Motif scaffolding. Sequence first.
Motif, PDB file in Angstrom:
ATOM      1  N   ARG A 238      59.556  52.372  -3.401  1.00  0.00           N
ATOM      2  CA  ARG A 238      60.452  52.673  -4.506  1.00  0.00           C
ATOM      3  C   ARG A 238      59.698  53.087  -5.761  1.00  0.00           C
ATOM      4  O   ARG A 238      60.185  53.931  -6.519  1.00  0.00           O
ATOM      5  CB  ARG A 238      61.331  51.453  -4.782  1.00  0.00           C
ATOM      6  N   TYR A 239      58.514  52.528  -5.990  1.00  0.00           N
ATOM      7  CA  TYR A 239      57.746  52.809  -7.195  1.00  0.00           C
ATOM      8  C   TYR A 239      56.647  53.831  -6.953  1.00  0.00           C
ATOM      9  O   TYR A 239      55.964  54.229  -7.902  1.00  0.00           O
ATOM     10  CB  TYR A 239      57.131  51.524  -7.747  1.00  0.00           C
ATOM     11  N   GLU A 364      63.815  55.447  -8.789  1.00  0.00           N
ATOM     12  CA  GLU A 364      63.204  54.182  -9.173  1.00  0.00           C
ATOM     13  C   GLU A 364      64.188  53.030  -8.986  1.00  0.00           C
ATOM     14  O   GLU A 364      63.781  51.885  -8.772  1.00  0.00           O
ATOM     15  CB  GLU A 364      62.707  54.256 -10.621  1.00  0.00           C
TER      16      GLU A 364
END
Lengths: 473, 101
Positions: A238-239, A364
Amino acid sequence: THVLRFGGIFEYVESGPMGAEELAFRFAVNTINRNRTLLPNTTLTYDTQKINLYDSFEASKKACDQLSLGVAAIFGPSHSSSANAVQSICNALGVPHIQTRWKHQVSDNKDSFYVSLYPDFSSLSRAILDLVQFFKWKTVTVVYDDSTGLIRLQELIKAPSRYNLRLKIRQLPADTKDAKPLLKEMKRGKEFHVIFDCSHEMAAGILKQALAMGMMTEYYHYIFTTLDLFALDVEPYRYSGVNMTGFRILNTENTQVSSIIEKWSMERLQAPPKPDSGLLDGFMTTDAALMYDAVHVVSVAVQQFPQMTVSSLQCNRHKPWRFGTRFMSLIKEAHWEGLTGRITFNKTNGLRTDFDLDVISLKEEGLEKIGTWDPASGLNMTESQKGKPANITDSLSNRSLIVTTILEEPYVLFKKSDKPLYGNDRFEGYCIDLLRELSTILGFTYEIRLVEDGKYGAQDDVNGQWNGMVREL
Amino acid sequence: GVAAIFGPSHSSSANAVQSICNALGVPHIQTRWKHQVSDNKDSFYVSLYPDFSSLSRAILDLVQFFKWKTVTVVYDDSTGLIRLQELIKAPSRYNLRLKIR
Ligand SMILES: *[C@@H]1O[C@H](CO)[C@@H](O[C@@H]2O[C@H](CO)[C@@H](O[C@@H]3O[C@H](CO[C@H]4O[C@H](CO)[C@@H](O)[C@H](O)[C@@H]4O)[C@@H](O)[C@H](O[C@H]4O[C@H](CO)[C@@H](O)[C@H](O)[C@@H]4O)[C@@H]3O)[C@H](O)[C@H]2NC(C)=O)[C@H](O)[C@H]1NC(C)=O
Ligand SMILES: *[C@@H]1O[C@H](CO)[C@@H](O[C@@H]2O[C@H](CO)[C@@H](O)[C@H](O)[C@H]2NC(C)=O)[C@H](O)[C@H]1NC(C)=O
Ligand SMILES: *[C@@H]1O[C@H](CO)[C@@H](O[C@@H]2O[C@H](CO)[C@@H](O)[C@H](O)[C@H]2NC(C)=O)[C@H](O)[C@H]1NC(C)=O
Ligand SMILES: *[C@@H]1O[C@H](CO)[C@@H](O)[C@H](O)[C@H]1NC(C)=O
Ligand SMILES: *[C@@H]1O[C@H](CO)[C@@H](O)[C@H](O)[C@H]1NC(C)=O
Ligand SMILES: *[C@@H]1O[C@H](CO)[C@@H](O)[C@H](O)[C@H]1NC(C)=O
């Protein structure tokens, strides 16, 4: 008047609970029987059988066992070798055959008593082709898993004949599930735009083998063919800044549709998943959402047909069913906004080539709907001139740049002091004054980190490998 | 009462007779090509038509003996991609440039 018996053919597991497609077939019939608004005077009854999903002679027994017992529809044995055997039985005896998965339908198969609620890959291959033109690609690296996947993407393979794409078709290994020899050849060949044709059980398996390698960066873009991208447990990716993109037909925006999925998680209590499976815990797959819709679309057709008496047929004595051609025309002329959105059929084939997708993508926050596909509309990608929302949340002007450097007088020196506590402050010189006033103008944060080799940059001839700061760049 | 069944010679029909011949024990001799899926645990069948795991490698030897760089593979039905999948995967390692029509 009290029963309309449906037929079901499902996977035989040896010790586990019921399958995902079978439990949705249970949950759909029990919903219509309780909620007495739809079918107020007829109560449905299920008759489920178990096959090995690879035995077309066992699946032909269970089809004739239901025809001798008396059914009204057979909801698919859900596999390409088994569904072709049951389709020719259902075409012979007259009873409809509702399919919920894709199947290679050959061109000279003159069958009419079948519908398919899985979206056709004549439309899904045109939807993936719209995302490789909205993103303006030139080199794709289509990866499939089995040899049937070339038929599922044949409108994408024929694309360099007219457009400016450059296909490089690869294949996942057959026996093992370790794609390290594949992904290393994709890193070395500089292939940053990949179209995976996998299931969601194997889509989570590649990404853990693409995170163990250095391929989950901000350079790579992944388009997934599967409609179950929303079921991936994407916490670690996700990051990273990876550009995961994919479709979704499961209409998870409506309050009524999301209420049924919440009731689906309250029926699968005894099902602990694997911790290394990389999937979520409570969700409905798109393989079970179509079986929930397949009971409802046929139940629309029995609402407009109240003189339906379920007969008992014999396979050896070839007799067609009395209400076969009329009840089949009511199924193909149906509309029902089920869990997978708007449902309508091709009316020439029985396929489903008119549906509503939701283009999802990884940000994000997670997966967010960033578009909408519709066959006679093209991509309605929102994407808009606003784009990113109102301001920058947790302002990314930090993004602390690790400025590498080397020490040389008077460019970079150590500060001559007695007090001991430092860190990106013990440096002084010409370049440190320059770097400080570039951070004043541009507004970034910098963290000075000396090169641990003490060289500027050199093309090492015997290795072909850099040596110094340009190696760190 | 027979001893062998010499194929109904079509991909939708041979898969149904193979699972009968696998069940009852009688051999099933095939004389045409058929898409055999990977998890079909059958043993009572032979196929005298040459496999396209070998014919696709033989066509790939003629596009390297003639030293080509751009081919234009043309098929007729969607099964023909499986018959030539060792030729389609060739630009991944060689210097061909496929244009499939
Ligand atoms: C199911 O029902 C559909 C419609 O409800 C019927 O039509 C099929 O689906 C689409 C319709 O758009 C066709 O795909 C498109 O074909 C176009 C070709 O135009 C004609 O060309 C041939 C050759 O002469 C004719 O024989 C034929 O009649 C075609 O109509 C392409 O130009 C399209 O490309 C682009 O279209 C739009 C443009 O913006 C984009 O949104 C697309 O993404 C794409 O880039 C498109 O390929 C399909 O070919 C039709 N089927 C057939 C057999 O023609 C069907 O009859 C019915 N059955 C099936 C199996 O689909
Ligand atoms: C990954 O996603 C981000 C989401 O914003 C993309 O960011 C922008 O994408 C557009 C093209 O759609 C570019 O014109 C912008 O320059 C991008 N802004 C950036 C990178 O700050 C990003 O391009 C995506 N990465 C890809 C496609 O490789
Ligand atoms: C494509 O854009 C949106 C969806 O991305 C469609 O919906 C419109 O959204 C705007 C903004 O809220 C509304 O003002 C319109 O009333 C919406 N139209 C509807 C719901 O029909 C929009 O219709 C699409 N445009 C097309 C297909 O031309
Ligand atoms: C039964 O389902 C319909 C939708 O088909 C819905 O409108 C209705 O409210 C449901 N019944 C009850 C009691 O909620
Ligand atoms: C079932 O109910 C509807 C409405 O209540 C009615 O019109 C229909 O005739 C009934 N079916 C019968 C009696 O078979
Ligand atoms: C910069 O943004 C916020 C401050 O608004 C901070 O919490 C965040 O950690 C910083 N980002 C970095 C250092 O990458």
